[PDB]
DNA sequence: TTTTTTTATGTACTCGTAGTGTCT
DNA sequence: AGACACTACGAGTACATA
């Protein structure tokens, strides 16, 4: 049953009408498939934007419920070498369909992990067999694809999901589930997603499990922040104010109590302070240079471990020494 | 059978003897285990990614969850634990992991469905995912995305940055918090009571203070102090000094001597005292930590001096985190902080 | 390799009753090493311009094609000594343009330039050329060409640069910077390129960092010290030193695994500490006690399960003021003969 | 010799009575013993104390050990052959004898000994002594991270090292940490008096022994070996002004420091590179070379505080570089060039 | 949706050498060669999407007439092209007897010749030298440096260059006239701008815009095709103020879904191929970009790292 | 004017013991 | 019934890598 799948998998779009966020790409793809002129597609975008869902719904619209048989779907989980290309892809492109009449579809999902020899062998398979089959390449990084292979497909850039699309999907989920969400909680949820539907769905499931009730109550910002362990804007601005204004000992005590009372992480506080100070209008850019350099160095050091107290004191001292030049 | 396991647990180190067996024994990591308990009644366990400092209980939490889910019978047939002591290249991920994910779930017995929920999926846990190469990690993407109906993936790591962004997006992130004195004093007192550890007032809270968010190291230090107190047989209580002497902490007088040498003195006497101090084996990480605590918490230095001391201690810790020579780094730090 | 027809032909070159002529384009190759001293080597070099000029005049008047002798020199120097490519160029361009004297030769040379990879010694010369990094030479030999120079052979270019970057006379010294400062900056960038190369050829196979290793290891240290070549371009000696150190590490590992039963120390802990005393225990009694100190040395080497080969290998680790390469020759041959004779006589418990 | 006079039990130690009492405490109940990590200066006597602790956990047969040969196959046709020092109660592994293939040996051998149960006709577990855990790369340490916890009833690790800097935090947490401080000059002189009384050495003055201590920097392995070495030059009778025999590499490093402080040029940098090559080719680690060269450069009285500060700063920088690199000469020559530019 | 139509890149693929709008010199050379015969061994190199494969295909077709099926041996990178293939099949084709007109020869087309192994390339030398009177070889590659010098010495070298805006505009106008598509001057200019001398990419973007919006306008072209990636990176690196470069990186690159790895790689490539600044400044910028890339590859790829890279670049430019 | 370097997956070549259908 | 050409799956050896 579908009631056992996680929310990321349970709410996977099955038709092109359930893929929000991408409107310029979805409409053009629908027109491609309606007029018949469907070229080789290259869906390039960040993770969780809806490329795999889009191509699956497209193949479903093209072939019907018989998608899993009339389409050759290869991914990084499967062995994709030059011999794999030579045999499988060429034999799939050269022959005809077994169940119906129509062009074939080769979905090379996550093709950014393919070998250079495989792409060099495939670039002439795409150009030779182009009247009976098609190629759709999904990618997160366009630098791992050879320019020859990159020039044979129509490139569609999947932009990060905007506010309206994620809010629409959240409303759809809140209709599908017996769940209520606060407005400010919804805004905070949009803020910690960066256009990733997977993260939104996962944390929504986690906060629904966190409610500890039969779901007669509403999900507030406190529930979200305690679920994802993210710092609140209130504590963020309090720590920033204590660093900028209060003394060294006072700022140290404030940072310690804020990061120990809620169990917050230093990397999350660093990211939040960076996001907040981005709107700060300052004097000569030397302070910004010092701030960015020292904060990136501290982040790279945190990414490898060490003493958390030493790194917190380093963050405080770096911010103070950077703002000491803005006078 | 059961009695043999009880005796083996009773004759094991306190780290493994008091390993949490249920989702209730975990004390401080409540936000994650609340969701884990609420999903135990449901059947929609998502792909999970545990990350946090070492010794916070990630492996213990996932083991207790798998136990409470499957029972001690299906625990050995519906799990796939892949640790860092095994090969985890592209070949392994493509053959073994994918074959296990494509497998159907094992049929539960009659006794399993009576006491345990027995969800219709299995769990493939990957401990220490930091060592997994980026290509072997990207290979897991569709493996975990298409076979989610029959298997569930649980990644465990310390540095969440070592895992690629798509895998971190596919899994729900559970951040395990550092176990300081406040949220682990209950567990430490329970461990001390179960072992009749006669300690003083401010010992346990001090132990975790030396642990810096690590309950395993705290339990090990408690076991060492208990052994050292039982060998003597004096019947007294363990003191904070007896704990800090075996934990690698530099005494306060030796630290005051270092502060006096840095405050007053030139390169020569500082170098001589550093050479003499390195004879007595102390970990430079603990020395840097104590110096940072002393310099930051003291209300006797200027803010301009405090920013510089913080940056210098940060640089020294970052250089020590790469396996450098402790003597050279400590001498360089003390000299740099001696020059105003 | 070890198996192949190369060695078979090399051995055939020793026993034959019929003339055996061999033709190859690259002589100084490792696979061509067995042919070093077995066959008479003849080198065909760059042909002279006069004979090629006469041949071109002939094939031009024969093919109804106009050509002046002033262009043949440029054709040859762009072709870099290949009459075949010159003939193909004439046959290809003659079908449309029947005359090429001084007007269309620019595009002809720019379109038929021989893009050949330089030897690992010519890359060292071009990298350390001070004119290339000048303000005029920079916009002629661009940075892309400098990186392609390294990419011609990315296995020796960093080593060749690190070998002879401090053996030149710099001509790009900034005002207020001495030669030592530029050499120190080049060495710092060499260390950074070393870190990058270690990150490249390690786990995770970060080969996409190869262009970066191009700049840090080769381009930047050369630019910092570019100029004239003072002496000769010395080949990188790091390879031979690494081979010697690896062999010595193998020998020291054998010695440590032989005497672990008594020392209970590490390889480095035995090399730094035990050998300065093992030398005076084994070798020193020979210089002061003649040939009657043999039993003591045998007993000492037995107490730690040493061997004759181990004894000979131990004395090769010491450097500086303690070198035994002459001390062993100073020992009377009678003492050494008695020692090696007693070695193959007394039984030794492994 | 340092081997003829070495303690074999806990009651035979002659320094660090607090550490001996702690070891007795830890070996009182031997079956409820966690993993241990002995750290401290090189040459303090931690490898002897580990064997003395095993002699208290088991019978005296722990010292009767044998060296066997074990073979392993990598991902390719390459084969590795390494010698294991095994005993009827424990085994000793030193992965510092190979390159990046230590993780395979670690995982395979440790899983084998974990699944393997001890034999009879000689307690319940079999100890493993990981010698020089600093050479273990992060991959092998990560592989051992879970092996330490999965099999805790049969395999107890006693990891011997000289500095916990390259040891990862999980491994540090997974075992007790025992520091072995280097013995003071008094205890070293006391041991030297006993060994020269047993070896029949003639001393006109006792203070020379103290000087040996002041020449060993707490190291007993260096002190005893240097005493036996200088006893061979003075013909079993040490004088009141007997010279201190320094190792050849130390004298070479001192001469290199002299060449650095006297001349600062590129022609001298070539000779410095040649000396560094000669030192590296004769089985001398580059970290020790850098440490000793920096400490010798700081001892030069011709320089001032401004020079010594920059020297130690460049030394730490290039120490990090060498710890992050593999071509050791590429960092050593850079450090030497930076020092030349500083002076 | 039962059947699809051929794309305009394949449908309007040139079948005669006159329809090629590439380099006029080499095209006229190949035309004269096919008209007179005696086609020599050739190696055609260039960039993707400029008319290299179509050029040699049209040459072979117009040179062989109806005997194309039995006189042309086409081998791509998709087929096995090892030493065994060169030894057996290529040699059997070169030795194969075929009665051709007294001005033609058998042609062996080898697409993507820069991917053949060294053994096959070495074995092909005598194969093409011993049968050079009845078999001719035409290689089509992107990098002439990947082909060994002995092979290049026995053939002509044709280096195809980028297609100027005039040629691509003429070809697009011809395609529009043959398709009757409503367009606009700004739309065609935007297509040429986003093509970057790539004729195939230009035709593909044109067909996409036509089938997605109907009218070829700059608005629709920019809506369906984003601005070129290297140009925005160049504008970001060449910014005079740190705030301008930070705003560019935030809005144009980071807010549009460009990964950090792609951003740092494009920055490295632009700084390498830059010519506005001196060599030393470019070297320091490449050093900083590589220092940032070393952190991006370790999984620390975020916006803060790119911001710090831009700050360090501006500090370097701050004299 | 010249020799070497740890490892990690993909690619290509080679000999090669082996498993089975066929002919003196 | 059996011998031996044909053959195709497997261990070993290198060779690159933007
Ligand atoms: N535009 C969208 N509309 C609705 N749900 C979406 C959308 N994009 C993503 N999702 C959700 O996120 C899940 C994963 O989407 P995918 O298409 O697999 O992500 P992706 O774009 O392929 O990126 P990858 O797989 O990490 S490279 C889907 O099953 C949906 O539940
Ligand atoms: N939250 C906790 N509650 C109780 N005991 C805990 C907790 N966390 C850790 N421990 C103790 O520490 C031991 C180690 O637990 P682990 O789960 O292995 O730690 P960890 O998070 O896996 O650290 P690693 O493996 O180095 S990332 C357990 O067996 C417990 O004895
Ligand atoms: N000069 C041209 N005139 C007309 N159409 C052209 C021209 N060049 C390219 N095209 C179009 O581009 C398509 C593919 O061109 P190709 O010749 O395959 O590209 P290429 O130059 O060979 O580069 P590759 O194949 O990627 S290495 C052709 O089918 C034409 O539709
Ligand atoms: N307590 C002690 N009393 C006397 N000698 C000791 C003592 N501890 C160690 N030693 C000496 O140290 C030598 C071994 O040193 P070792 O333990 O290998 O150094 P490390 O501590 O670096 O492993 C032995 O020869 C032994 O004589
Ligand atoms: Mg996908
Ligand atoms: Mg764990
Ligand atoms: Mg082509």
Numbering used by the authors:
A (entry chain C): 9 to 335
B (entry chain D): 14 to 353
C (entry chain A): 432 to 781
D (entry chain E): 4 to 125, 133 to 353
E (entry chain B): 4 to 322
How did the manuscript describe this experimental structure?
In contrast to typical AAA+ ATPases, clamp loaders are heteropentameric with the five different subunits called A–E.
To reveal how RFC:PCNA binds and responds to DNA, we analyzed two classes that contain DNA-bound RFC:PCNA. One class shows PCNA in an open lock-washer shape, and the other has PCNA in a closed conformation. The RFC A-gate is open, with all five subunits gripping PCNA in an open lock-washer shape. Unexpectedly, we observe that the 3′ nucleotide of the primer strand is melted in both DNA-bound RFC:PCNA structures, with the base flipped away from the rest of the duplex.
